[PDB]
């Protein structure tokens, strides 16, 4: 259960410390459409992970970075919090304006179940998927720094049984955030 | 075996990322005393880890950040891969200028240990940073993006046991470097 550490790791090491601050960032860019006050994060169950959003879906645009967040961690000084605003398309136009990113760890995981040494099988990728999903679920929904800033959206692609949009995806959550 | 996972994500989402970058960038910094070409990353095994290097050891002091390293992942645009450099101190010395950082998923989970649903008793703290340890050592002599661009500083302090020098041990992978 590797996917147990990565979920924990990725609330103690980002989300946790970004949380807080979000929407004082995201209040800042509107100011200086509007962004939502959530930070949608992406969880493919089959751990595909495209690092770009647009080539995920062409209906996903990116837009502008929010003011980026520093803090000094471990002896790095102004460690750097980015975070990247999207516009989301239907039928040529723009339905929606958010922070959206993946979750990383799920991409370290597909890593991991190609390198031999990491003794990580390629079919558990799914169970591990799911697992990681389950454990962040749970820790958001206790977590004190958790408080209307973030949204998980999880799915199953048909993967070429059929066609995907991963925009209508996001935009369903986000019109009922609505 | 949480440390398993943590090694291998501080490897597949750090490491190989940063070190085909690094020696460029020092050499960079350089041109535009002489920083060394090699990352040096503290493992202490009771996991402590300090946000401000300064704070563990008055020796080692902050001198300036490297060029910044940019890369677009997981939906976040120009995600910012950052580093210092410190100059380590010996009886009002310098004795050398390097790249310095704790290694942060040690500070991951020490974290862990102290969450309940996070199922990790605070007695394991050690026998994980030593499986982290031998494993990211184990991957990074296999890593091809490993060529003496890094070091592992693995100690263990006496704990008030006795007066430990944190700069000392630095230095002393330092000058075996020379
Ligand atoms: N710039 C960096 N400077 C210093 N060190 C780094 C950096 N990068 C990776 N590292 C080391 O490699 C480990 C990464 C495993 P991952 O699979 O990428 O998942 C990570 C990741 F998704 C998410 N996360 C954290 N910061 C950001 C960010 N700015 N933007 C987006 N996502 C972030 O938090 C997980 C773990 O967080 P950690 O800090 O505790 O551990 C890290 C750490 F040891």
Redesign the pocket.
């Known amino acids: 259960n590797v996917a147990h550490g ?1 979920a924990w ?2 609330y ?3 989300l946790r410390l970004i949380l807080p601050e979000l929407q004082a960032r995201i209040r800042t860019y509107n100011q200086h459409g509007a962004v939502s006050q959530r930070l949608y994060i992406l969880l493919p169950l089959d751990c595909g992970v495209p690092d770009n959003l647009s080539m995920a879906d062409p209906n996903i645009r990116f837009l502008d970075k929010l003011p980026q967040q520093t803090g000094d961690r471990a002896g ?1 000084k102004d ?4 975070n990247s605003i999207y516009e989301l398309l239907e039928n040529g136009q723009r339905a929606g304006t958010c922070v959206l990113e993946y979750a ?2 799920l991409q ?1 995981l597909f890593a991991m179940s190609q390198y031999s040494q990491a003794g990580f099988s390629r079919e558990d990728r799914l169970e591990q998927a799911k697992l990681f999903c389950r454990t962040l679920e749970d820790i958001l929904a206790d977590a004190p720094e958790s408080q209307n800033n973030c949204r998980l959206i999880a799915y199953q692609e048909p993967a070429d049984d059929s066609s995907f949009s991963l925009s209508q995806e996001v935009l369903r959550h986000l019109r009922q955030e609505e």
């Open positions: 990565l790791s990725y103690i090491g980002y790095i460690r750097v919090y980015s990383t760890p370290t």
